[PDB]
Amino acid sequence: GSMKMYDRWFSQQELQVLPFAEQDEQRNQTWLELVGEAQQLMDERCPADEPRAIALATRWMEQLEQDTAGRPEFLTRLNEMHAAEPQMREQTGVTPEMIDFIVRAFAESKLAIWARYLNDEELAFTRQHYFDRLMEWPALVADLHRACREKRDPASPGGQQLAQRWLALFQSYAGKDAQTQQKFRYAMEQEPHLMKGTWMTSEVLSWLQQAIGVMMRQAQGLPPN
């Protein structure tokens, strides 16, 4: 995309940190392929749950996580840009239907893994509700970055507020039965792909796991650590 377009969707200081502002020929070439491979899979009407769609969507997320600099605020902005910018199709070829295809295929990549850990009843619930709150995660993760940046205490009311927001999003697709929720923790301990495309750093994750440990700590029974 042209520089005039990022210039109206990002403040000046934001452009100092956004890799898309950099004129990199290899990044430009990568995105041409990614956008071209998506457009071809769409032209073929490729199902979202097929390996080609899964492999492409995984490549998209990795490239977005790098080219937003792991800043969820910038993913959020790019999402707003694609759906509202008049010159999105012309300057990038990216359309809302393409972004919906990549997002659904990336979801399929994880449902594909969860299918091996959840029974069909649990799995039907997740596939049913996966998209209900999906778009609310970027703003939460950004607050997790901000709360970790500002050295907030995971046990403070402010921090326990964030662990509540997380539990809301988590339970939205995982359910409310502890037996089912722990199949999810097991999968995440065994499946590196379940953590991809979450704009989480080791540090932010370490902060959230503390905040969730305080929230879920039981008076008796093995504590967390």
Side-chain angles (χ1 to χ4, degrees):
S2 76
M3 297 297 296
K4 205 224 174 216
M5 165 172 169
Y6 296 103
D7 166 52
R8 50 166 173 263
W9 284 93
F10 295 83
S11 66
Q12 292 179 336
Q13 55 109 344
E14 280 178 336
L15 291 175
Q16 304 298 71
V17 181
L18 183 74
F20 278 114
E22 309 175 2
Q23 299 172 325
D24 180 55
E25 56 184 305
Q26 187 128 27
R27 181 188 314 115
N28 163 255
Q29 175 61 22
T30 305
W31 274 111
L32 284 160
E33 303 165 346
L34 295 184
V35 173
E37 298 189 16
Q39 187 61 67
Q40 187 61 36
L41 289 176
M42 293 163 75
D43 286 344
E44 303 167 4
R45 295 208 150 87
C46 170
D49 59 315
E50 287 194 353
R52 300 176 293 157
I54 282 171
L56 182 71
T58 304
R59 291 164 56 193
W60 270 67
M61 292 303 134
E62 165 64 0
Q63 195 60 40
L64 274 169
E65 218 161 1
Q66 279 184 8
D67 295 355
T68 62
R71 273 171 142 279
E73 299 86 2
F74 288 171
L75 178 66
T76 290
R77 196 74 55 74
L78 288 180
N79 193 21
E80 289 160 4
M81 190 173 75
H82 100 274
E85 171 49 49
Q87 297 167 303
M88 191 67 178
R89 171 61 210 244
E90 327 300 18
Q91 294 241 282
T92 62
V94 176
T95 64
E97 43 271 48
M98 183 189 289
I99 297 302
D100 192 62
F101 172 73
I102 298 296
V103 179
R104 287 181 292 117
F106 190 73
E108 292 299 318
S109 76
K110 293 186 178 179
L111 295 162
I113 297 171
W114 278 311
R116 300 189 215 106
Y117 292 88
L118 314 185
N119 62 41
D120 273 353
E121 293 182 341
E122 290 162 331
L123 183 66
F125 182 95
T126 302
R127 170 177 295 280
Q128 171 90 50
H129 300 275
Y130 195 79
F131 300 100
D132 292 355
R133 304 251 221 153
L134 192 136
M135 304 314 306
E136 298 182 27
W137 283 88
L140 176 58
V141 173
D143 292 338
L144 292 170
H145 283 242
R146 154 168 134 75
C148 189
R149 173 207 320 159
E150 296 178 351
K151 296 299 301 235
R152 180 166 304 129
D153 192 319
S156 62
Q160 286 302 278
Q161 282 174 357
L162 290 182
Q164 290 288 346
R165 287 165 66 183
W166 173 89
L167 186 67
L169 305 189
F170 173 61
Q171 294 191 135
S172 135
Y173 65 86
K176 300 202 184 178
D177 304 283
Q179 182 71 104
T180 296
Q181 304 193 343
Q182 291 183 3
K183 306 182 175 184
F184 276 81
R185 179 175 55 157
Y186 182 25
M188 287 176 143
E189 288 165 359
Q190 298 296 328
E191 299 292 351
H193 184 69
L194 298 180
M195 292 300 165
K196 302 299 179 178
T198 70
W199 276 252
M200 295 285 301
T201 86
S202 168
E203 193 188 33
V204 180
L205 175 54
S206 182
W207 189 99
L208 180 64
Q209 278 194 280
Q210 288 174 64
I212 296 166
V214 165
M215 152 181 297
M216 316 279 271
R217 175 156 195 179
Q218 303 201 312
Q220 294 176 265
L222 178 61
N225 268 343

